[PDB]
Design a binder for this molecule. Sequence first.
Ligand code: VTJ
Ligand code: VTJ
Lengths: 296, 302
Amino acid sequence: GSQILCVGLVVLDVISLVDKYPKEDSEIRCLSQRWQRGGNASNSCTVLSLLGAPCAFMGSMAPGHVADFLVADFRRRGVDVSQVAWQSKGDTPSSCCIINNSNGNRTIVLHDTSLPDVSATDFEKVDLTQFKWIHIEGRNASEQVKMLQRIDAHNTRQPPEQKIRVSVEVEKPREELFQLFGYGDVVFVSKDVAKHLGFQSAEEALRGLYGRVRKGAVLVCAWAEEGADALGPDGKLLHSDAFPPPRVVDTLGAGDTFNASVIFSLSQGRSVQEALRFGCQVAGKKCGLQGFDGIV
Amino acid sequence: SGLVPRGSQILCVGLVVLDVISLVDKYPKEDSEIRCLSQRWQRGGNASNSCTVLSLLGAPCAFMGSMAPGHVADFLVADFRRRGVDVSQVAWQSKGDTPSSCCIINNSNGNRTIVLHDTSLPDVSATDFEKVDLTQFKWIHIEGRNASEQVKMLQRIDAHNTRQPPEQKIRVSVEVEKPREELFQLFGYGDVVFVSKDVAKHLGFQSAEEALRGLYGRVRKGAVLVCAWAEEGADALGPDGKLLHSDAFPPPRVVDTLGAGDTFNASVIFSLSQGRSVQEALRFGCQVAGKKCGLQGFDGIV
Ligand SMILES: CS(=O)(=O)c1cccc2[nH]c3c(c12)CCCc1ccc(CN2CC[C@](O)(c4ccccc4)C2)cc1-3
Ligand SMILES: CS(=O)(=O)c1cccc2[nH]c3c(c12)CCCc1ccc(CN2CC[C@](O)(c4ccccc4)C2)cc1-3
C-alpha cells in the first residue's frame, strides 16, 4: 500500500509556444518548440512523482520510437511503468499543442490512433496490494466500471486501514462517462462538463450533480480563475480561491496538476478544505511555468 | 559512410523540416481540445524535397543542412534514408531545435493554418562548407536562406572550378523562393538561377516572361534564369536572349501540390546534369512536377 496508480492515457504532446493564437488561413512563427509526455493520467503521474509520491502508470502503449521517448521520460521522473498494456498495433497517440505565451491558453489537436484501451481483463492481472490510491481517467466507461467493481470487491475483504482509496475524472461531456459519477471516494468534474450540463458555476454544478455520486463520496469542481469547490456527505460547500501567477504562460496540464495535488494531499491525511487549497496552489504555480519543472 | 566516386553526386544545401499535418472537421477555437480526422508526419524543406525527387530520378545525391540531435532528427534521418539520400554532410548542432512546423487543414474549406518552426537552430556556415571535400559532387544546388554566408560558399565553388578542366567543373544552381531583400545578391551566382512566382509577383511582375526579362540583368554572364508559373508552365532565359517556354502537364485530377516547385527544380537540375538542353530540361521539369500534382507525396512520380 505505498503507490498511487493512475489509469488513463499517455500521449506525445508536440508543443508550439506562440505569442498570439493564429487566425484561420494565417502563417505565424512559434517562439519555441518541445515534446512533452502528455495525457491526463500521465501528467498526474509527473506531478505525483515531483510531489514525492511513489506512483505507477497504467495505459496502452505501442512499441516504437515515440514509446521509447515516453518510457525514458516516465523513468527519468521515477514513474513505475510495469503495468503498461503493450499493444500489437504500432501507433502511439500524439497531439499538436498550441500554447499562447500571453495568457497560457492551450489548444489541442489530438490524434486518436484508435489503439485498444486498457481492458477490465488487463486490470484483473494487476496485483492491488501495492497501491494505497487508484485514480481513473474517464475514457471507456463500460470497461472502467468493471475495474472499479474489482477495487470495490477487494476493499470489502480489507479492514478500514488497508482499503484502497479511489478517484475518477469526468473531463469530457460524453453521456457514457456519466455512469462513472456513482464510483469512487473522490469524483472530479470539469468546468466543460458542468457548462455542457447547463451549470454556470462550481457551486451550481456541485449542488446539481451531488445526487449522482455514491454514499459518502466527495464531488470536486475546479473553475479556472474562480478557484475550486468541493462537496461531501455533510452537505457543506467548501471553496478555495485560485493562486494565479502574476504572468500566466502555460495552462497545459493545469487541471491534471490540480487533480494529482488534491489526490496527494488527501492520501497524506489532509482535510478536503486543505486538499482544495493545495490543489489550487500547485496548479496556480504551474500556470506561471512552461511544463512541470519548477513546481518543486 | 562508404566510398563515394569522384564527381558523381548532386548536393542540395538548404532546409529540412518536420511537418506535422492535422486534418480537422472544424478549425479549433482557442483553449479547446479537438480530435483530428487524420494526422501525418512528413519530411519537408525545399532542399530536402529536391533530394527525394533526385533519388527517385536515379541520381546519387546528398543533403547538406542543419539538424540537432533528438527524436525529430531521428525521424528526419530515417525518412532521408528511406528515400536513399546520403546524410553524411548534415551540420550537427549543439544549440537549437530541429525545425518543426504544425499545419492545420480544414476539411470543410481546404484552408491551411501554419505555425512555422522557430529560428533557434544555426544555419550552415561558410566555415562548415569549407570543411566539405567537393571532388565527389558534379552539381551543387543552394536553397537561398542566409545569403551573406551562402555567397562565400558560392565563391569557394568558383575558386575550386578555376583549377578544373571543363569536364571536372562543378555545376551550380541557386533558388530565390522567399521575397527577402538579402537573397537578391544570390542572383549574381550560379550557372542556373531559379526564381519563384511569389518573388516575381512581389517584385511587380505579372508573368514568367515579365519576370525573366526584368530580372535577367541580375544574373552572372552566361547564366540561365528559370521561372515556373504553376498552370502557365515554365520559362527559361539564357545568354542568347531567346525566351524558352514549356506548357504545364496538369494531371486529370489535382491531389497535392506541396513540393511541386521542388519537384520541378530537381527535375530541371537532373535533366541538365544528364547533358540535356535547357528546352528539354524545362519540358521534363513540367512533366515530372505535373505528374506529382496528381499524387499524394512523391511515391509514383518515377
Ligand atoms: C486548478 S486551477 O488552478 O484552478 C486551474 C485548472 C485548470 C485550468 C486553469 N486555468 C486557470 C486556472 C486553472 C487557475 C489559476 C491560473 C489562471 C489564471 C487566469 C485564468 C483566466 N485567463 C486565462 C486566459 C484568459 O481566458 C484570457 C482571455 C483573453 C485575453 C486575456 C486572457 C483569462 C485562468 C487560470
Ligand atoms: C513545375 S509546374 O508543374 O509548372 C508547377 C510547379 C509548382 C507549382 C505548381 N502548381 C501547378 C503546377 C505547378 C503545374 C500544373 C498542375 C497544377 C494544377 C492546378 C493548379 C492550381 N492549384 C490551386 C489549388 C489546387 O487546385 C489544389 C487542388 C487540390 C489540392 C491541392 C491544390 C491546385 C496548380 C498546378
